[PDB]
Ligand binder design. Structure first.
Ligand SMILES: [Cl-]
Ligand SMILES: [Cl-]
Length: 198
């Protein structure tokens, strides 16, 4: 039972405020990126792509990436990455769309991804609607891969979503928006949640 979906975990850059590669931050028995990929592997994807930036060498040494398509890019500047452009070139032609998530959002669930994909069949874009706002994971149909490619950064998908040019389906998830990690404070907050829910 093929899903005809490729998962794309954007894990390049966005680490300058931490002062260390956030992908490698300890999160229990694993790393932050390891935790996200553990979940991503359990989603109904036919293919899983992970993008990495300047810290790729260290990440390759410390995170389990076997069986994944690894897309390596240059650093793009502070608060920016362009890895999605490269990732698209690797997407299997059989994929009807992709699901986008960040390498630093391990709190996303495989059930939410499954519901997102189901709502995304026949929608141009779909997004998760949590109790306290819209957030990742996002669905993007093959028909707008060209528009994605033209975005200036990995975290600029919200501009396509908010543009009104394309249908955007909101898929309800009975949870709050997953935590992500921009700053050291964000990391400690996420770690405390992992410690608590453990
Ligand atoms: Cl940054
Ligand atoms: Cl990086």
């Amino acid at each position: 039972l093929r899903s005809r979906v490729t998962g794309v975990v954007l894990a390049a850059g966005y680490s300058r405020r931490l002062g260390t590669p956030k992908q490698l931050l300890p999160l229990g028995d694993t790393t932050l990126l390891g935790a996200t990929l553990a979940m991503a592997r359990r989603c109904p994807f036919d293919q899983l792509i992970v993008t990495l930036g300047g810290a790729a060498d260290e990440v390759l040494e410390k995170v389990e990436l076997d069986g994944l398509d690894i897309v390596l890019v240059d650093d793009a500047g502070l608060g920016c990455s362009s890895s999605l452009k490269s990732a698209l070139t690797w997407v299997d032609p059989t994929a009807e769309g992709i699901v986008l998530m960040l390498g630093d959002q391990p709190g996303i669930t495989a059930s939410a991804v499954a519901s997102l994909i189901a709502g995304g069949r026949g929608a141009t874009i779909a997004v998760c609607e949590y109790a306290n706002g819209i957030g990742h994971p996002f669905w993007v149909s093959r028909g707008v891969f060209g528009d994605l490619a033209e975005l200036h950064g990995d975290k600029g998908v919200w501009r396509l979503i908010e543009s009104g040019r394309h249908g955007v389906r909101r898929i309800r998830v009975d949870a709050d928006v997953p935590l992500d990690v921009d700053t050291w404070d964000d990391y400690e907050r996420l770690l405390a949640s992992v410690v608590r829910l453990e």
